[PDB]
Amino acid sequence: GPRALSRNQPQYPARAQALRIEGQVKVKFDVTPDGRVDNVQILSAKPANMFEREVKNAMRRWRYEPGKPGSGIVVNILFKINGTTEIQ
Amino acid sequence: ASGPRALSRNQPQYPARAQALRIEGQVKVKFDVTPDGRVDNVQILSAKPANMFEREVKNAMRRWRYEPGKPGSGIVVNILFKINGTTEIQ
């Protein structure tokens, strides 16, 4: 059913980035026939009180094809800290 | 411009311990290039934090390959170990 057109990545909260805190947020939502996200609910957020606002802010930006609704869709959003190298 | 030119420069592995501790670092190296195109006389000029990145830097630089027949001395490179946050939608 629902077909995503744009799913903006959330901003990594600056505090969490500075502290090198990883997280996971599991979210349930509906896709309306207008192609918008609706009825967003945070199923779990670990650690909590850190990533939820940026997750909800990103999901308001998401767009799906109109005329193809669906309800009770679950996504998992991962906030990852990773090490990379550079030869200068 | 002049001097030894690299054919291959292997990126160092991020040490597991450093990944686990989510720490960054920097290593500055001075080295020579032999006629066979190998790195030699590796000198660590700075390594911060200490006792974390030196081994993986050295192990990578022994893999590097330069043009043969064009030796040189005193080449300097800076190696960064960077931590950044990324996101994934699943």
Curated annotation (Swiss-Prot), chain B:
Q: Which part of the chain is the TonB C-terminal domain?
A: 1-90
What are the entry keywords? Bacteriocin transport, Cell inner membrane, Cell membrane, Membrane, Protein transport, Repeat, Signal-anchor, Transmembrane, Transmembrane helix, Transport
The main place the protein resides is membrane
Q: After gene disruption, what is the outcome?
A: Cells missing tonB survive hydroxyurea treatment better than wild-type; further disruption of mazE-mazF and relE-relB yields even better survival.
Q: Name one GO molecular function term.
A: protein domain specific binding
Q: Which GO terms describe its cellular component?
A: cell envelope; cell outer membrane; membrane; outer membrane-bounded periplasmic space; plasma membrane; plasma membrane protein complex; transmembrane transporter complex
Q: What induces it?
A: 2-fold by hydroxyurea treatment.
Question: Could you state one GO biological process linked to this protein?
Answer: transmembrane transport
List locations, semicolon-separated: Cell inner membrane
Q: How does it assemble?
A: Homodimer. Forms a complex with the accessory proteins ExbB and ExbD.
User: Its biological function?
Assistant: Interacts with outer membrane receptor proteins that carry out high-affinity binding and energy dependent uptake into the periplasmic space of specific substrates such as cobalamin, and various iron compounds (such as iron dicitrate, enterochelin, aerobactin, etc.). In the absence of TonB these receptors bind their substrates but do not carry out active transport. TonB also interacts with some colicins and is involved in the energy-dependent, irreversible steps of bacteriophages phi 80 and T1 infection.
The entry's family comment says: Belongs to the TonB family.
Q: What is this protein called?
A: Protein TonB
